Design a protein around this ligand. Structure first.
Ligand SMILES: Nc1ncnc2c1ncn2[C@@H]1O[C@H](CSCC[C@H](N)C(=O)O)[C@@H](O)[C@H]1O
Ligand SMILES: [K+]
Length: 246
RNA sequence: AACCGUAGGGGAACCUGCGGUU
RNA sequence: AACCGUAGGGGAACCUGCGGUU
């Protein structure tokens, strides 16, 4: 349908080149189950099925856009109508290739959710807002979510997508990012690990001895008078174990 | 210019601490 | 858990100084 409820952040990607570049990056092989957050009118959906899928899952929230199991008449296509920011991905298999052009308003929530379902997603490819994409990369800017993702996934940037390659053109830039899973370190209950990092990135300009005891930081060999945006990934592991109750 | 980087202004997602009624 | 309060964090759209480049 038209009217495209902008409250849902639905901007249809109308560009052949990037649509199939998003699909190719998943490395879809013979018997893979792919999950697509926010299918929409199904521009990416039509491209994913062009690959040798086993099963395409589409998690769409819009009860009018989900009705578009239309011309896309495929036996291996199933459309689930629920919120992908809260949906349990691991209720669809043990190894799932997640993909999706994310709506800006909830994009960060779906990413956080897939990291919760890490055990059943070997790799994910997302189209996100630039200020979210460049943040998750790590090098120029970070956040609590950036480290939360990178702890389990090796984030590798793919491409920038100009606002013109969309129908209702967003005022922000977009980017495709690939989330390849790499076994860094064993963090249990991501619930309290998230709450840990989100307290460290609180007042990120201030020194660290101001949020974690000065000598307790001198323990892990971490400069007490250092900012949050200087710590290696190991540091985040290194100090989380012995400061936060798990 | 747009674009990228950078420095403010601006405040929309989202987050935490404490507290209150439960 | 939930709703409210409260202190901060965070900083998108949009605006500008500066530096590259059409
Ligand atoms: N919470 C949520 N969970 C799942 N899907 C959502 C969602 N919130 C919004 N969406 C849907 O996700 C889509 C993102 S726009 C992506 C559309 C698609 N790439 C295309 O071009 O056809 C929108 O269609 C929107 O309706
Ligand atoms: K503030």
């Amino acid at each position: 349908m038209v009217r495209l409820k902008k409250s849902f952040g639905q901007h249809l990607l109308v560009s052949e080149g990037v649509l199939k570049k998003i699909a190719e990056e998943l490395n879809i092989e013979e018997g893979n189950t792919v999950v697509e957050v926010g299918g929409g009118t199904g521009n990416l959906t039509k491209v994913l099925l062009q690959h040798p899928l086993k099963k395409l899952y589409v998690i769409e929230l819009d009860r009018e856009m989900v009705e578009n199991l239309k011309s896309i008449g495929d036996e291996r296509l199933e459309v689930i109508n629920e919120d992908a920011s809260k949906f349990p991905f691991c209720s669809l298999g043990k190894e799932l290739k997640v993909v999706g052009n994310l709506p800006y308003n909830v994009a960060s929530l779906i990413i956080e959710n897939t990291v919760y379902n890490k055990d059943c997603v070997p790799l994910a490819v997302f189209m996100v807002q630039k200020e979210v994409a460049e943040k998750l990369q790590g090098k120029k800017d970070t956040g609590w979510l950036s480290v939360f993702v990178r702890t389990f996934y090796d984030v590798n940037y793919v491409m920038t997508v100009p606002p013109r390659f969309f129908v209702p053109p967003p005022k922000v830039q977009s980017a495709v990012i690939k989330l390849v899973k790499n076994e860094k370190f064993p963090v249990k209950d991501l619930k309290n690990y998230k709450k840990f990092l989100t307290k460290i990135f609180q007042n990120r300009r201030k020194v660290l001895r101001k949020k974690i005891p000065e000598e307790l930081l001198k323990e892990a060999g971490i400069n007490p008078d250092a900012r949050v945006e200087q710590l290696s990934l190991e540091d985040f592991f290194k100090l989380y174990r012995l400061i936060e109750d798990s």
